[PDB]
Structures are given as C-alpha cells and as structure tokens.
Amino acid sequence: GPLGSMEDFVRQCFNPMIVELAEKAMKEYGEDPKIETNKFAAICTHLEVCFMYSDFHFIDERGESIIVESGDPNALLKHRFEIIEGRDRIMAWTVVNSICNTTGVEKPKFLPDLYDYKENRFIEIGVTRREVHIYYLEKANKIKSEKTHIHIFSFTGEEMATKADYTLDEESRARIKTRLFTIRQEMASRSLWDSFRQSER
Ligand SMILES: [Mn+2]
Ligand SMILES: [Mn+2]
Ligand SMILES: [Mn+2]
Secondary structure (H helix, E strand, O other): OOOOOHHHHHHHHOOHHHHHHHHHHHHHOOOOOOOOHHHHHHHHHHHHHHHHHHOOEEEOOOOOEEEOOOOOOOOOOEEOEEEOOOOOHHHHHHHHHHHHHHHOOOOOOOOOOEEEOOOOEEEEEEEEOOOHHHHHHHHHHHHOOOOOEEEEEEOOOOEEEHHHOOOOOHHHHHHHHHHHHHHHHHHHHOOOHHHHHHHOO
16 A cells, blocks of 8 residues: 555544644654654654553542543542653653652652552553563663553553553553554554554664
8 A cells, every 4th residue: 555654644643732742752852753753653652551541540539449431520539640751851850759758659760651649659651562571671671660660561462560460450451452453553554564663673
C-alpha cells in the first residue's frame, strides 16, 4: 500500500491534547517533532498509556480503591493516581515535592510517571517495541530507585512489572493493550510500523 506520514497518523489518531503535550515535551528537550517523528509517536503513545493507566481509578469514602467508568464520579471520591508525566519540568518536580514531604515517601532521582495513593509508591511506565524483560532491566538499571515501581507494556501484549505486582486489574490493563494493538495495526496499514518498531534502539 501507499506510505503515509507519521505526522498524519499522530494528528488523526491521538487526541489533540496529547499531541500538544508531546510537542511541548519534545520542545523542552530540544527535539524536533517534524524530524524525530517516530519518537514523536512514541511520546504520544507513552503519554496516552499513562493517562489510561490512571483513568477511572478512585479512592472511595472508606479509603478503598474502586473503578468508576461512568461520567459523574460522586464528589467525595479522590483520584487514585497523581499524574507526573505530561507536565513541564518545574511543575512535575513541584508535584513530586508536594507528594513526598506529604506522604513521607522519599524523593526520586528521575521524574517518574505516576504516583499511586493506594500502594503509596511512584510508578515508572514503559512502552516498548522490544522484549519486555530487556526493557524492564534497562529501566531498573537507569533509576535504581528501589521504591519506584516499574510497569512495562510491549506492543506484543506482554507486560513486566516489579515483583510481579501489576497494580491494576486485568480489564484496565486490557484497555491499554487494546489501544496499543490498535496503534500498531493502524501504523501497519499506513506502512509506518516496521520503521517505528526498528527505531526504538
Ligand atoms: Mn474528578
Ligand atoms: Mn515519564
Ligand atoms: Mn515512562
């Protein structure tokens, strides 16, 4: 089939809010979305996984975790996750600081992606086009925060998480894997997938 542009794919298949955040993210780190297009799509994907990971999860009036997929979560519910990814450098560290000195949890050395108020830990989310175990080890070796929980998703549907603790129910993680499958298939139909996969390096 004809070869599409990654730009077209990103703008057509990701929410504009996600795209704008990815653009702002690449700018902050001196990367050009119009040249590093595979990275651009990977940033969008990762960002969306982080949001989907957090979606629908609340801590109820008793302090127990629950899922509310309707539109109106009653006012007394608290979001289960703090989202750190998708924020500019200053705000992200401000949030991390607001979490740490509060919950007493120690400060990480790299910005994680989320904070889990139920499990009382920071989470690093990974999305890989490679083998989950390799990517997991790379992540672990980079941060070695020990307290930061790592959760990896691959585009083949495999997951790997610290201490075989996957945090979320099967359905939540299934939503994420369905979305990644959709991204991969759509890229493939536009003849963008092979390059995207090989780009991760
Ligand atoms: Mn709310
Ligand atoms: Mn991050
Ligand atoms: Mn991450």
